[PDB]
Symmetry: C3
Subunit: 138 residues, 3 copies
């Protein structure tokens, strides 16, 4: 059965200029994470790539942003992450995170991994898209 | 004494059309969770029910929203959850989550449970409302 | 080596009128936390102190706000926390959290501690600021 598992946590800090998606995937590959999620995140970005609700196109922005929240799941060959950033006036923007977000000064992350489970993306006949599927690691 | 505990995590995915409050409570009942919190959440909503800061009335909205963050505690007979959603333009809205939020394509959740503790809602003479009370499970 | 660790969690509730930064530091000192992060948070604030993206000055606001998300790391002699609050109209504001945020009715927190690691703030030659450094507790 799924859902239940203890968690192992990882703490890491990304460097200025690094692209978030690529670094997260590299960390997942390095540790062969099969059922992870972002348990905590704080930092800053220069370039931001977001896909707004219901939209197909990716919105690319550049400036000075603070990462307010980065949430979602990730695993060996898939992920689903949402990002919220704030600007110099406190105004926020949020959406589906896409490749292209670059670290400004830092990105601090605490990533949780559920050793008893395995996440995968399987087609959902209801939504019409590949959705999160949870199964036993063993 | 309270506060300290190891955590057991649960991963689940809600389906299109399901109402969030009811599904969360069903999961709490199914697993008899006594001291849980939302450790991670990502997804989309069609209907959104929020009670804004200091307001009594619930604001009901319908459209295409992305769940940016869903935070808070929950247990057998109580909860305190806040929700932040983004729209097709990246604009965000936040408030106290109320019953009526419906899943659009999916809602992925990682819920933590603290086995050594028990959450309850007891009247606080200071705030004048029932507030979070933490005690030992044993 | 760093990054990997089990986690111990703490649940607590702050009272009306208390200042968040001071209370968080008091909790860190009381439990001698060396590598913690905010795993969950919900509540309300009256006074809010935020430093917006790229700005030096702290913006002080007072009113009726809901805490939508409080994320970041914290330890014995340092921290990095970002805050997002919503107002009576659902509008949100976000930024680097500064001392001066006061609880309105309550602030519920689940704090994670990574016993196998130790967080510190060391100068980064790349960013030019003291950044998160992760090392073994032993
Ligand atoms: Mg999404
Ligand atoms: Mg509330
Ligand atoms: Mg910051």
């Amino acid at each position: 059965h799924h859902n239940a598992s203890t968690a192992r946590f990882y703490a890491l800090r990304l460097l200025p200029g690094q692209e978030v998606f690529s670094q997260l995937h590299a960390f997942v590959q390095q540790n062969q994470l099969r059922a992870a999620w972002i348990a905590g995140c704080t930092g800053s970005l220069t370039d931001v790539a977001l896909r707004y609700a219901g939209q197909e196109a990716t919105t690319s922005l550049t400036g000075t942003f603070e990462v307010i929240s980065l949430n979602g799941t990730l695993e060996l060959t898939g992920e689903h992450l949402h990002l919220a950033v704030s600007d110099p006036y406190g105004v926020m923007l949020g959406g589906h995170m896409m490749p292209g977000c670059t670290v400004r000064t830092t990105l601090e992350l605490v990533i949780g991994e559920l050793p008893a489970l395995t996440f995968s993306r399987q087609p959902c006949a209801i939504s019409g898209y590949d959705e999160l599927h949870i199964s036993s690691r063993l």
